[PDB]
Amino acid sequence: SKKHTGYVGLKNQGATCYMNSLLQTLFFTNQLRKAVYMMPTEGDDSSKSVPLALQRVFYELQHSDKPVGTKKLTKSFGWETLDSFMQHDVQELCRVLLDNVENKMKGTCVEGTIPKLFRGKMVSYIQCKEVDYRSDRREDYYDIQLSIKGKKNIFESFVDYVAVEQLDGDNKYDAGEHGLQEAEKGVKFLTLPPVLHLQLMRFMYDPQTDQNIKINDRFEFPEQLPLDEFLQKTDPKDPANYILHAVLVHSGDNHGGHYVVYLNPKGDGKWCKFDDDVVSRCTKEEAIEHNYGGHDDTNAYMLVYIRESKLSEVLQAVTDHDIPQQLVERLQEEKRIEAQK
Ligand SMILES: O=C([C@H]1Cc2cc(Cl)cc(-c3ccnc4cc(CN5C(=O)CCC5=O)sc34)c2O1)N1CCNCC1
């Protein structure tokens, strides 16, 4: 309900699984929302424009009192069924949406916005111990998938992510003209993006069974997340102190089940729980501490963090002015014609 919280829900579409969680997470990334409204979609066809459908949802989430539909957006990118959602993960859907949006933004006033918000850079290195050979690759990333099994927390997951693997014994390094070799393998963060998307690896392959078994472990994650010690070169002018923004959560059976996002939309520690059409207020503890794990003696799977330095910019106030007039004309013209029944 909008009166209690200020925010509105999305319609209970069970087929969607994790979409409603992601849409809210992306909508309350305000800098994206403003940029999305600027996309020049006056050209595009209503039924099939992914940019337009994400403008429609955003528009409505901002303006509506009653819960917001997603039927037109699901039809655009072509994941109408439950199996289309099951087959993919949340980060892949986030790529399907943002890769459309970034591509529409090229050659516009709002180009670069998706990399501005979401794209960090990292080095993957292989280094031989005895011989002088080193292979570096630079990779961009839009999201980090962290290991949780045996890890108490995010600090420990990052320790693991960056930690150095030894290529010795049977699994030595094939080092070209220099032959098979004892070597160190590792990864190093260069930049951490303003909006940081972390997936927690809740599934592993199992040797017996021949299937993916889920992990219902206590995995602790903090409101304030310092990450300078996981960068190669730090900056005193801009530390990598991250502030928690959203927590995406699953419960119940995997073949379906119930999805919720917990959110901190102003970044002021005032938490709400977005259960599909029912937005409500909740404690910090309901959002953070209570979504840690199977502690009776429900699991968090994605976490969003925002860079403290970039917080005011990222979560800048959206106004009705920030949506173009022609887009307001178009989207109200649908609501005029569709109501006329
Ligand atoms: O089993 C499920 C249900 C139930 C279910 C339970 C939980 Cl606690 C999380 C998800 C979930 C939902 C969305 N995204 C992601 C990403 C995750 C990170 N991760 C892995 O763990 C392995 C590889 C990877 O990237 S976990 C996840 C989920 O979905 N699905 C079948 C497979 N794809 C999703 C649907």
* CATH number of the domain to which 178 belongs: 2.20.210.10
> How far apart are the CA of 89 and the centre of ligand 1, in A?
6
Cβ of residue 212 lying under 6 Å from some atom of ligand 1 = no
Whether 253 maps to a domain, the answer reads yes
- Domain range holding 134? 120-141+162-192
User: Are residues 44 and 64 located together in one domain of the fold?
Assistant: yes
- CA gap 245, 286 in Å, rounded: 14
Give CA–CA dist 162/231, Å, rounded.
Answer: 9
199 lies in the same domain as 281 = yes
Are 126 and 269 members of one domain? no
User: Domain for residue 90, yes or no?
Assistant: yes
The beta strands (E) that lie in the chain are given as: 120-128, 134-141, 144-147, 165-167, 173-174, 180-181, 183-191, 195-201, 203-205, 212-214, 224-226, 241-251, 258-263, 272-275, 278-281, 299-307
Tell me, yes or no, whether 155 and 294 share the same domain. Answer: yes
Residues 178 and 294 in one domain: no
Please classify residue 215 by burial: count the beta carbons closer than 10 Å to its beta carbon, then call 0-12 exposed, 13-18 middle and 19+ buried. middle
What HEC string does 319-338 produce?
Answer: CHHHCCHHHHHHHHHHHHHH
Which long-range CB contacts under 8 A does 253-257 form with residues at least 24 apart?
254/214, 255/86, 256/14, 256/17, 256/82
Nearest protein CA to atom 29 of ligand 1, as residue: 254
241 and 336 together in one domain = no
Return all residues near 341 (Cβ < 8 A) that are at least 6 apart.
none
Alpha helices of 119-189 — where are they, by DSSP H? 154-162
186: β partners: 125
Helix (H, G, I), strand (E, B) or coil at 256: coil
Provide the annotated active-site residues.
17, 258
Beta strand pairing call for 173-174 and 180-181: antiparallel
> In this structure, are 186 and 115 located in the same domain?
no
| Distance between CA atoms of residues 147 and 161, nearest Å | 7
Do 181 and 105 belong together in one domain?
Answer: no
Same domain, 26 and 98: yes
Task: State whether 225 and 82 are in the same domain.
Answer: no
Q: Is the minimum distance from the CB of 199 to ligand 1 under 6 angstroms? A: yes
Is there a single domain that holds both residue 146 and residue 240? yes
3-state DSSP assignment of residue 188: strand
Domain check: are 177 and 235 in the same one? no
Residue 303 class from Cβ within 10 Å (0-12 exposed, 13-18 middle, 19+ buried)?
Answer: buried
Instruction: Compute, in angstroms, the gap from residue 192 CA to the centroid of ligand 1.
Output: 24
Residue 174 lies in a domain: yes
How many domains does the chain contain in total?
A: 3
